[PDB]
Amino acid sequence: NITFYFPFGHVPTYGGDFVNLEHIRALNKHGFSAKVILMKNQIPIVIESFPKDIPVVFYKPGMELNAQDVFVLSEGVRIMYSGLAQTQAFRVIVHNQNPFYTHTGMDSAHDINRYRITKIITPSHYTVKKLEEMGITKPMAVISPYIPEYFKPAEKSNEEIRITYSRRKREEESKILLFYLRSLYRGKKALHIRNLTNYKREEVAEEMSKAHIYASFAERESLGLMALEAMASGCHVVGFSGFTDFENQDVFNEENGDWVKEGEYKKFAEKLIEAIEQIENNTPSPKIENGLALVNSRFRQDRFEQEVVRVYQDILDNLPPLEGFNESDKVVLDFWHFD
Amino acid sequence: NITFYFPFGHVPTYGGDFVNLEHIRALNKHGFSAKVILMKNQIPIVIESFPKDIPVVFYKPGMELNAQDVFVLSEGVRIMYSGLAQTQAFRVIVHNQNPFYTHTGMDSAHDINRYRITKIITPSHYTVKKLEEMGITKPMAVISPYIPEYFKPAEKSNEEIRITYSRRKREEESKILLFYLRSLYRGKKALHIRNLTNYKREEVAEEMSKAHIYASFAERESLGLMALEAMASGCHVVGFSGFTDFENQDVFNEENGDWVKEGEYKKFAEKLIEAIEQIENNTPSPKIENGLALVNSRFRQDRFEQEVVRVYQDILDNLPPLEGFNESDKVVLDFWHFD
């Protein structure tokens, strides 16, 4: 009789927030008990932002949960760690979806290593290695997010070349690259380039579905979701991989994208021009087919649901003993006083 | 009877603005004629911000200059290029101090190559190669800025270790690095780390003068002035070089800094710890001496003044013929209508 509680303090916003809702949904679908605990900002705009099928409990100082319950913490929100250090009750899992933001939740690896974390769930084997590089020695698990089914190819134009890119990361580097592209491209046809930085996620899917090429400005990725979305959409991916230490991941390779290294703006533009000429000649890259096959095999919902069940059941099968409590004991939560 | 006109539209702000004032000062000191032309914002706060020894002329639609005069344009401020394309009078030099911002002034290399630019002055041989990589074929020259004399070593503490760094660039990467440093450093002593991002330039000099180590977050540099300031101050420089294509510059090398590559946060922290232990043991790096010698020999005011005279005289000795004007003819400037 264990519930997994996922703390939120705001409307779901970041990629990471939406993944956590998918964790909750998969858990509840497959016989587990999972809920949002909304720690603060208990106002209608926030409350109403959680879909109907997501259970929400409100934090109130003095409420009681069960000693056996599990908190699934972000790598951020330091205050969740300091509060829960006030009791011996509960288990703690960290869902670290952003290894380079580990500094937003905990002071150092030492503090993580001394905390009663039972497991760290990560998006990728790369993330595991990055946290271990940082000095973290806690047990780790991988559950990669999935690409929603509405990312898929649509018919692409046979008379104009459509390129899309995001400036969410590397805003200034996209301007540099596009300057090289304008400087080096000598083909006849005008290029159709669209910045999708501020599109809604379904609009991103729509734009990619019709795009021939996705110019990648990925940066310090865990998995590389934008690129995988592009691959799901049948786009040729050209540009930054998101991994300076590219050798520490095995999702992206020479056969599913034209990757460049930091600062390689000329090579980036040259690869774009090569990709443009392939589309102009109606001989699109075989890297598109490889990218499609990658997403189909590894990054859709069925496999995610399998991995959620596997990983969370393994955690439930391997919990530390409760110190100072029995299962079913009620425990007051009064560790936070928010505005 | 040639005057060099340096356009400004605001109080001197950026590094580049202050370098241009030093160009003006050197030119006027050594027998040339150079002035600011203040294009707009002719209000006391702006007017008063120019030092007394900097000549300032105000743009007014309908004013006259001499056909032979030379405009020294920034790589930015597109409107200066479009305006001056309305006449055959004048010569144009570009002082491109920021090659990665070339996109802020001109659409492409093609547009630069077709413009009547007589010479592009740059901060470094690296910058020359970068612009040429981009497809620019105009003649180029190098005048490196100098480090002001108030950057120099002061006595440094023998009992605490002082590190300084800037977040002007790579704001988020400094947090990542400091997280690795906190995670990996196991020495006794508490570190004295100061962020100087918002210090005045003289305060930067003061802080560096007392600092043992400068942690470098340089990014897409032309020359690497912050690092050179640190070297002038007797700091050990550790971290990012500012040059992804490090092989295309020859200022920084293994003997004057502990440079790391992109994403190498662990190696960065490890080099910092090595530098900390050297200071703790009173055996500071010989790279400090090499850095001092570099600045003394190449980056002080006397050499800058030599290079200004050399480069600008070479330009005056090699001007294109005036088309459609004689020397001494008056030419109306009415190409801009600013707020």
Residue numbers in the entry:
A (entry chain A), B (entry chain A): 4 to 342
How is this structure described in the published paper?
We found a previously uncharacterized protein classified as a glycosyltransferase encoded in the Actinobacillus minor NM305 genome and named the gene product A. minor glucoside-glucosyltransferase (AmGGT). AmGGT exhibited processive glycosyltransferase activity when UDP-Glc was used as the donor substrate and, unexpectedly, showed different acceptor substrate specificity from that of the homologous Agt proteins of other Actinobacillus species. While the homologous proteins transfer glucose residues to the nonreducing end of oligosaccharide chains linked to peptides, AmGGT cannot use glycopeptides as acceptors and requires the nonreducing end of oligosaccharides. The AmGGT protein consists of two lobe domains, which are typically found in the GT-B fold proteins.
A substrate-binding groove is formed at the interface between the two lobe domains. Although the asymmetric unit contained one molecule of the AmGGT protein, the gel-filtration chromatography suggested that the AmGGT protein exists as a homodimer in solution. A dimeric structure was generated according to the 2-fold rotational crystal lattice symmetry. No protein degradation was observed with the E135A-S185A mutant protein. In sum, the AmGGT protein is a homodimer with 2-fold rotational symmetry in solution. In the AmGGT structure, the side chain of Tyr16 protrudes into the substrate-binding groove, narrowing the acceptor-binding site. This bulged structure likely prevents the binding of glycopeptide substrates, such as the Glc1-peptide, to the acceptor-binding site.
